[PDB]
């Protein structure tokens, strides 16, 4: 799923050095991105959406239940007229991407946080350089407005989601020559108000300066689409305890890269449950975070973990692997990882996995382990006392693995909270109704706005008409659509047309055809008694 955000604002009317405006260059770049992505044999399941800088009823051009034909037709007729309302457009796009999330089961907020339930989405937000306006002045903060929150959105406290990356294109093409071609293989950043918003999600922001640089950035962007598993790392709290082959001193601490969870839907178990201590009676649930604040500690702690535990291959995208490569990729050794923010009743973090590398030393495998592996792996009334340290709802998925061996547990203590189940079906129904109402009025514009609003300065109610583009005057049916110049000739033409008594008469003077004239479409409505047997 790819949602292209093209502003089509009035500031996108300035002409480049090639002769076309920035909007035409953006549309051409989108078309070349389409034809480049079509090369990879994986573009048979994705869906394209379009978002412009227009009113909430008119911002979306093609959303759910819209094929490629209507999407291309809407992107073709894009007009650059309006202000640069970036915040409202980003909010509308994020709400559109989060319409079918509370109904299928993604981010249920009650049963862990399953990383194998993915809904990838990439935003391009092709906008102008700077100087965004909000009908009052020029702002320099880019704060997303919060006026009408969706039902069930206060449990994340952030507009974007687990898998929602945000790339940006500014299209800073000069007007005279664009002769800046010193650095060949180098794509700098835009350094604008959208740069922090993009970096928070996990995607960079390109700075287009030349058509060659545009082609380079488009060819570099097609290689950044996969399953979205974005997790945040922190150096705390080990004081860079990497004393293995050298001495530490770094910027590879707050790594917020993605992870490629390739399927073999995705197959996996043992998710990151949450970051708080869930109580048995809690009417209000604390809001989750889109990026989990999980921290790693550099300790050997028996990296050899061999068992019949179901295996996972959530591949990690190499972005800050320099710190690992400095220590020879940690051969035959790993380092634990633990989620912060009160992972248990009374403690600060519980190691639930590690980041052991592969034998090929190519990337990090991201070995996800159970909540507390070094205890259950090595019954004398031990498991009954051990199952009290883990979160309650967490007994859900692990028991499935126990199904591979037997079934000692039951549904006696399989209860998260009596108040968490309530006020959940109503929120899901409200979200479904909102998604249906949004998908219903998605393409039907029905503007019907043509007036001059004649002010005084039949009274207080007059309004002069405006020039209608698609008027289609009926010359043979309506007599008012016949001007004075070609009146007598048109009169004789109408007379001859009425006195001819032909078959299948029409009221159009000369209606040649539409913009498209297909050969197969016209040849299908015919009959040819021939087969060419010879």
């Amino acid at each position: 799923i790819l949602l292209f955000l093209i502003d089509t604002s009035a500031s996108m009317n300035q002409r480049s050095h090639l002769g076309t405006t920035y909007l035409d260059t953006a549309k051409g770049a989108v078309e070349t991105f389409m034809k480049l992505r079509a090369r990879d044999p994986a573009s048979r399941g994705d869906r394209y959406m379009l978002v412009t800088f227009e009113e909430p009823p008119y911002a979306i051009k093609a959303g759910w239940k819209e094929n490629h034909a209507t999407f291309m037709n809407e992107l073709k007729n894009l007009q650059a007229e309006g202000l640069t309302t970036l915040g409202q457009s980003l909010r509308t796009a994020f709400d559109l991407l989060n319409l079918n999330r509370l109904v299928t089961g993604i981010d249920n907020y009650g049963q862990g946080r399953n990383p194998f339930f993915l809904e990838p989405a990439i935003i391009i937000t092709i906008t102008d350089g700077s100087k965004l306006t909000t009908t009052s002045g020029v702002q320099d903060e880019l704060h997303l407005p919060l006026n009408s929150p969706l039902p069930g959105s206060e449990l994340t406290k952030e507009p974007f989601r687990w898998d929602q990356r945000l790339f940006a294109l500014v299209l800073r093409l000069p007007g005279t020559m664009s002769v800046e071609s010193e650095q060949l293989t180098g794509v700098p950043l835009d350094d604008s108000a959208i740069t922090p918003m993009c970096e928070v999600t996990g995607g960079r922001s390109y700075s287009v300066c030349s058509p060659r640089m545009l082609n380079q950035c488009l060819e570099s962007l097609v290689q950044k689409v996969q399953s979205g598993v974005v997790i945040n790392f922190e150096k705390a709290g080990p004081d860079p305890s990497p004393v293995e082959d050298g001495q530490p001193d770094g910027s590879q601490p707050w790594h917020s890269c993605h992870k490629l969870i390739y399927v073999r839907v995705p197959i996996g178990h043992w998710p990151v449950p949450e970051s708080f201590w869930p109580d048995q009676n809690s009417p209000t649930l604390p809001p989750r975070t889109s990026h989990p604040v999980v921290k790693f500690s550099c300790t050997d702690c028996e990296p050899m973990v061999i068992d019949k535990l179901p295996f996972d291959k959530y591949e990690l995208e190499p972005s800050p692997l320099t710190q690992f490569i400095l220590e020879r990729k940690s051969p035959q050794t790993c380092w634990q990882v633990y989620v912060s923010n009160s992972a248990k009743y009374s403690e600060l973090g519980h190691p639930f996995g590690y980041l052991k590398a592969s034998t090929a030393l190519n990337c990090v495998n991201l070995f996800v382990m159970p909540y507390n592996y070094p205890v259950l792996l090595p019954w004398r009334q031990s498991f009954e006392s051990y199952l009290k340290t883990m979160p309650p709802y967490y007994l859900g998925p692990l028991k499935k693995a126990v199904r591979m061996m037997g079934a000692p547990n039951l549904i006696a203590d399989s209860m998260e909270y009596g108040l968490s189940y309530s006020v959940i079906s109503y929120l899901k129904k409200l979200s479904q109704q909102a998604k249906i109402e949004s998908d219903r009025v998605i393409g039907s514009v029905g503007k019907k706005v043509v007036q001059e609003t004649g002010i005084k300065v039949e009274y207080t109610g007059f309004q002069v008409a405006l020039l209608n583009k698609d008027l289609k005057p009926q010359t043979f049916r309506n007599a008012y659509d016949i001007p004075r110049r070609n009146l007598l000739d048109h009169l004789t033409r109408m007379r001859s047309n009425l006195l001819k008594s032909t078959r299948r008469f029409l009221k159009g003077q000369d209606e040649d055809q539409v913009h498209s004239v297909p050969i197969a479409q016209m040849g299908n409505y015919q009959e040819y008694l021939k087969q060419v047997p010879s």
Partner: protein, 165 residues
């Protein structure tokens, strides 16, 4: 031939609710300091306060496009008053004939949005054509935008001097 005394006279006229004579004497001082606006006006003759007083004079004189053009002579363009003036519908300054003096992309974008909102396609097309110029692109190396801005300043100041007195 003294810019200081002309500025003092213009300020005195502005204090007595005389805006036309204030603009007259302001343009007179501008023609005294710089030779008929052929060169850039000195920063001490036309300060921020003088340009703000010119904007105040042109605002109450039913000249809103002139206000929007004058809001670009400041060190920092005040878009609030420009958008407040361009929103009026009782201008007396040939709105469609002063769009060539605007070299700011934000003001032209706001003009295009206002013309599209009110269904004024004739002026909306003029605004878009003014945006699609090669001189102003908001991406030049600043050696071209400054020259075009100075040329438009000279042209607008000479037109305003031909208008008054």
């Amino acid at each position: 031939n003294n810019h200081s005394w002309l500025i003092i006279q213009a300020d005195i006229y502005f204090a007595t609710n005389q805006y036309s004579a204030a603009l007259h004497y302001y343009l007179q001082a501008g023609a005294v300091c710089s030779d008929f606006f052929n060169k850039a006006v000195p920063p001490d003759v036309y300060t921020d306060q003088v340009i703000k007083r010119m904007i105040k004079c042109c605002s109450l004189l039913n000249c809103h496009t002139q206000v929007a053009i004058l809001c670009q002579f400041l060190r920092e363009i005040d878009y609030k008053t420009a958008f407040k003036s361009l929103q009026e519908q009782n201008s007396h300054d040939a709105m469609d004939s002063y769009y060539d003096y605007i070299w700011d992309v934000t003001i032209l974008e706001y003009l295009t949005y206002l013309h599209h909102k009110r269904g004024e396609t004739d002026k909306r097309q003029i605004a878009i054509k003014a945006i699609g110029q090669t001189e102003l692109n908001a991406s030049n190396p600043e050696e071209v935008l400054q020259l075009a801005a100075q040329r438009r300043k000279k042209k607008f100041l000479q037109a305003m001097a031909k208008l008054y007195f």
